[PDB]
Amino acid sequence: IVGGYTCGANTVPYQVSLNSGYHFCGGSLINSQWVVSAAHCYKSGIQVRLGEDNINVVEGNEQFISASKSIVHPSYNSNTLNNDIMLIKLKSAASLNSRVASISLPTSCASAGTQCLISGWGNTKSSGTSYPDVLKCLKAPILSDSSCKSAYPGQITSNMFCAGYLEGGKDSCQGDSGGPVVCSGKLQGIVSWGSGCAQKNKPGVYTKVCNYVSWIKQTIASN
Ligand SMILES: Cc1ccccc1-c1cc2ccc(C(=N)N)cc2[nH]1
Ligand SMILES: [Ca+2]
Numbered sequence: 001i002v003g004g005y006t007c008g009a010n011t012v013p014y015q016v017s018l019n020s021g022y023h024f025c026g027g028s029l030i031n032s033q034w035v036v037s038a039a040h041c042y043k044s045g046i047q048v049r050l051g052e053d054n055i056n057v058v059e060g061n062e063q064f065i066s067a068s069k070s071i072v073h074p075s076y077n078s079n080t081l082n083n084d085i086m087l088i089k090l091k092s093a094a095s096l097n098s099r100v101a102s103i104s105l106p107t108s109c110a111s112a113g114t115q116c117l118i119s120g121w122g123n124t125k126s127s128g129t130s131y132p133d134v135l136k137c138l139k140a141p142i143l144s145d146s147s148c149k150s151a152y153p154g155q156i157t158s159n160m161f162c163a164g165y166l167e168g169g170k171d172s173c174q175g176d177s178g179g180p181v182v183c184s185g186k187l188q189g190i191v192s193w194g195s196g197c198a199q200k201n202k203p204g205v206y207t208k209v210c211n212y213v214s215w216i217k218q219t220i221a222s223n
Helices: 145-151 209-221
Strands: 015-019 023-031 034-037 047-050 063-072 086-090 115-120 136-141 160-163 180-183 186-193 204-208
Touching: 015 034, 023 047, 023 180, 023 186, 023 209, 034 186, 034 209, 086 209, 115 186, 145 160, 160 186, 186 209, 204 209
Parallel strands: none
Antiparallel strands: 015 023, 015 047, 023 034, 034 086, 047 063, 063 086, 115 136, 115 180, 160 204, 180 186, 186 204
C-alpha cells in the first residue's frame, strides 16, 4: 500500500496473509473454512495466516492453517487477468473471534464514488522498494468505469473496476495482490493489477467480486 497508513493491529480481522515460506499475497476470510484471493496468487503449498499484524513476529493472536484445496476460477485468463479470483479451503476451520472474522459477500455491485478500505502488506514506495511488517490501510473511492477504461484502453473488462486517485500518491501495490477492497461492509474487490504503483492517471484495478457471488456460494457449498 502506497500513501496509506498503519491500520492498527487486527483492525481488519478478515485480512489474511498467504505464506509459502514468506508472505506473497493477501486474501479475505469469507467464513471459517474459506478464503477468497486472486487467481494470479495461485501456488502450491499455501499456508493461510489469520489474525496477523506484524507478519514477521508472533504476537499472540495468529492462526496458521494449511490450505487443503485451491480453486482458481474456471475462466481465469492469466494473460489479461480477466476473472482474477480464486478460493482457498482451510484444512481445519479457523476459530472465529474479534481478531479473526469473516467479511460478507456483496448482494449487489457498489457504485462509483463509494469509499472503500483497501489493505495489505505490499510495497509502500511509489518509486523504489520498502516492505512493511505491519498491515497498511488505504481509503479510496471507486472510480467511474469511463475513467478506468480511459486509463487502461482495451484492458478493462466487466469483471474489473478501478479505485484510487488519478492524481497519484495513493494505491495498492506489489504484495497486496489477492487482498480485500471492502465497501459498506461488503467485499467488493480483490487487489488484482495496475500500472506501476501510485502513478498519475494509473489507478489500481480490482476484481469485481459482485460478479462472482453465485460462483463463490455454489463452489463453497460443493467443496
Ligand atoms: C501486472 C502484474 C504482472 C506481474 C506481477 C505483478 C503485477 C501487478 C500486481 C499488482 C497489484 C496492484 C497494483 C496497483 N498499482 N494497484 C499493480 C500490480 N501489478
Ligand atoms: Ca504475526
